[PDB]
Write an enzyme that holds these catalytic residues in place. Structure first.
Site, PDB file in Angstrom:
ATOM      1  N   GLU A 111     134.743 119.025  83.032  1.00  0.00           N
ATOM      2  CA  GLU A 111     134.750 118.471  84.355  1.00  0.00           C
ATOM      3  C   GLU A 111     134.565 116.953  84.421  1.00  0.00           C
ATOM      4  O   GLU A 111     135.002 116.311  85.366  1.00  0.00           O
ATOM      5  CB  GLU A 111     133.606 119.142  85.161  1.00  0.00           C
ATOM      6  CG  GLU A 111     133.829 120.634  85.351  1.00  0.00           C
ATOM      7  CD  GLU A 111     134.942 121.001  86.291  1.00  0.00           C
ATOM      8  OE1 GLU A 111     135.398 119.987  87.003  1.00  0.00           O
ATOM      9  OE2 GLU A 111     135.351 122.140  86.392  1.00  0.00           O
ATOM     10  N   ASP A 140     139.881 115.782  93.012  1.00  0.00           N
ATOM     11  CA  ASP A 140     140.120 116.647  91.887  1.00  0.00           C
ATOM     12  C   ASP A 140     141.606 116.786  91.601  1.00  0.00           C
ATOM     13  O   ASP A 140     142.434 116.130  92.210  1.00  0.00           O
ATOM     14  CB  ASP A 140     139.327 117.974  91.890  1.00  0.00           C
ATOM     15  CG  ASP A 140     139.812 119.056  92.841  1.00  0.00           C
ATOM     16  OD1 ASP A 140     140.955 118.802  93.397  1.00  0.00           O
ATOM     17  OD2 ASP A 140     139.196 120.080  93.058  1.00  0.00           O
TER      18      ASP A 140
END
Ligand SMILES: [Cl-]
Ligand SMILES: [Cl-]
Length: 162
Positions: free
Chosen positions: A11, A20
């Site tokens: 991540e 994202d």
């Protein structure tokens, strides 16, 4: 290698609101803020999550606090889910990390939708499950991360991460 170190590799860490891979507003260690297009809808959620006026920026400690909550939530979610729990229970310690990883990324409902792959994992048919997991949007959208997770399911080791 543990779940924390694994997700932190997948991540990344960012102290300022970012978007994202899907274009959603996120912060810290993969912490989804909102699916809404509004940067303001995101700054709001963020202050609600932190309990302070952040103005889109957080400290490392705050990011780790969110990460802790989210992994815990991921774990309890799998344990509460009728479709996921049996799978998790059947697995070894490494592979369990791989299922937690998918859940953190795609939510309980998403993973629970991988009916066939879940069935193959439970049966310990490693190669077959790895092949089936690859036939998904998930794998097509974030191939390097998917391959890593998939490898983890196939082998039962942390190779893909070292
Ligand atoms: Cl496909
Ligand atoms: Cl990727």
């Amino acid at each position: 290698m543990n779940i924390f170190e694994m997700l932190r590799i997948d991540e990344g860490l960012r102290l300022k609101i970012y978007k994202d891979t899907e274009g959603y507003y996120t912060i810290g260690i993969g912490h989804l803020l909102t699916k809404s297009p509004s940067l303001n809808a995101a700054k709001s959620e963020l202050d609600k999550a932190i309990g302070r006026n952040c103005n889109g920026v957080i400290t490392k400690d705050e990011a780790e606090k969110l990460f802790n909550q989210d992994v815990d939530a991921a774990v309890r979610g799998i344990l509460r889910n009728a479709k996921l729990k049996p799978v998790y229970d059947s697995l070894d310690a490494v592979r369990r990390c791989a299922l937690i990883n998918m859940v953190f990324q795609m939510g309980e409902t998403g993973v629970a939708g991988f009916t066939n792959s879940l069935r193959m994992l439970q049966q310990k048919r490693w190669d077959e499950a790895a092949s089936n997991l690859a036939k998904s949007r998930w794998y097509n959208q974030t191939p390097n991360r998917a391959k890593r997770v998939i490898t983890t399911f196939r082998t039962g080791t942390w190779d893909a991460y070292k």
